[PDB]
Structure 1
Amino acid sequence: GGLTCASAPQGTLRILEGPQQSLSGSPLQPIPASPPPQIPPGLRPRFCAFG
């Protein structure tokens, strides 16, 4: 009436919960790159010679 060893298991199942990968879009930056410093339009000379 006691507990005895039974037949060895024939296989093992290991369960884990996993989600999946999306598409590669690689959206690097809101406003991207190093935007260049640049000329103010027209500007004009702010200096003249004497005479």
Structure 2
Amino acid sequence: GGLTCASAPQGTLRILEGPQQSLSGSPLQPIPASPPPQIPPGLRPRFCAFG
């Protein structure tokens, strides 16, 4: 009436919960790159010679 060893298991199942990968879009930056410093339009000379 006691507990005895039974037949060895024939296989093992290991369960884990996993989600999946999306598409590669690689959206690097809101406003991207190093935007260049640049000329103010027209500007004009702010200096003249004497005479």
Instruction: State whether TM-score is above 0.5.
Output: yes
For normalisation by structure 1, the TM-score amounts to 1.00
* Structure 2 unaligned regions, length at least 5: none
TM-score, structure 2 normalization = 1.00
How many correspondences in the alignment? 51
Note the aligned Cα RMSD (angstroms). 0.0
1:10 and 1:47 map into 2 onto residues whose CA distance is: 94
Runs of 4 or more above 4 Å deviation: none
Q: Shift of residue 21 of structure 1?
A: 0.0
